[PDB]
Amino acid sequence: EEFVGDMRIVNVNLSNIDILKKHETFKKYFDFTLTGPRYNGNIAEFAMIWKIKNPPLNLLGVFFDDGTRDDEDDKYILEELKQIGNGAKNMYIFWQYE
Amino acid sequence: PVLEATMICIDNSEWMRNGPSRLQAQTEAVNLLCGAKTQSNPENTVGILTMAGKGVRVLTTPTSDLGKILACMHGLDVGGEINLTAAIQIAQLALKHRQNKNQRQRIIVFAGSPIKYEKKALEIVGKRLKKNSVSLDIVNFGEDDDEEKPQKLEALLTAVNNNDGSHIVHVPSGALSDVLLSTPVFT
């Protein structure tokens, strides 16, 4: 259990990002045509478009389930994103397995 | 669509390494399945328990919070052997004491281990679940050289199955979530 404010940090390990094409929650927000891990500024469909800075090799993306936040490429590293949930109840962090 | 409380019974038995970790394939399927269930109806609830380690552990009582559900499976332990009867009893009581009684009651068991129970034992459990209005989906995986296991699990299903509301899926070692996505566990 890790919380930042009232936002739960939810580590999700995937064998492959293709698993999320079949996920009835996460298929709505992922854009599978984009290279490198992204985060969403809002919860519009296909919102995960914003480039996470200096990502660790196995990081696949970040989904904030609520709130709105700053939307810039290569501005925030993973650890800085954890303070801008801005009302998100959950910050989903998708990882490559092993 | 359907309104439903589901308890998922995880196999975190020492077996789950052998045969992607059989633990990891289970976690991914559970993740997609909690996705389908919470997305199809906002008032659906899903709970999670582990069957092996040093005994039956509830990681979460039924909830509609997907984050709580997926978080409580990060960093799963693996070991011991499943306690299937204790798992099902605890799953049925959790469903009995659901908040919204308008919810249908469903248990999902991932049977990834040898099944160390007689047919008669499992039929009795299956008949009690039926009298308690609980449906059962069984995922049979990891044939640890037990032609005995598949038979015993189909006998459990027969005793419970009602209105074709209960299902079994046998998956070969040679894509767990791809398989289930087209099976009624998903549909």
Numbering used by the authors:
A (entry chain A): 36 to 133
B (entry chain B): 1 to 19, 23 to 177, 180 to 192
What did the published study say regarding this structure?
SAP05 binds both the von Willibrand factor type A (vWA) domain of Rpn10 and the zinc-finger (ZnF) domain of multiple members of two distinct plant transcription factor families, known as SQUAMOSA-PROMOTER BINDING PROTEIN-LIKE (SPL) and GATA BINDING FACTORS (GATAs). The SAP05 protein comprises a globular compact structure with five β-strands that form an internal triangular mixed β-sheet core. β-strand 1 (β1) locates on the long end of this triangular core and connects via a loop–helix–loop–helix–loop structure to β2 at the opposite surface near the tip of this core. The SAP05 residues binding ZnF and vWA are located at opposing surfaces of the effector with the ZnF binding surface comprising the loop-dominated surface (loop surface) and the vWA-binding surface the β-sheet-dominated long end of the triangular β-sheet core (sheet surface). Our data show how the bacterial SAP05 effector has evolved as a functional adapter of the 26S proteasome to bypass the canonical UPS cellular proteolysis pathway and enable ubiquitin-independent degradation of structured eukaryotic proteins.
As Rpn10vWA formed aggregates upon purification in the absence of SAP05, Rpn10vWA was coexpressed with SAP05 and purified as a complex using the same general method. The SAP05 sheet surface comprises two parallel β-strands, β1 and β5, as well as two loops separated by an α-helix. The interaction is mediated by eight SAP05 amino acids, including R43 and N48 located on β1, S50 on loop 2, H58 on loop 3, T60 on α2, N125 and Y127 on β5, and Y132 on the loop following β5 of SAP05. Each of these residues interacts with one residue of Rpn10vWA, except for T60 that interacts with two residues, and S50 and H58 form two interactions with E31 and N34 of Rpn10vWA, respectively. Four of the interactions involve double or single hydrogen bonds and one salt bridge, and other interactions comprise nonbonded contacts. All Rpn10vWA residues that interact with SAP05 locate on α-helices. The Rpn10vWA interaction is largely mediated by polar forces. Thus, the SAP05 sheet surface contains rigid secondary β-sheets and α-helix structures that are held in place by hydrogen bonds within SAP05, as opposed to the ZnF-binding loop surface that involves protruding loop structures that may be more flexible. Structural superimposition of SAP05 interactions with vWA domains of plant Rpn10 and PSMD4 revealed that SAP05 loop 3 clashes with H38 of PSMD4 precluding a SAP05-PSMD4 interaction. The structural superposition of SAP05–Rpn10vWA complex onto the spinach 26S proteasome did not reveal obvious steric clashes with proteasome components.
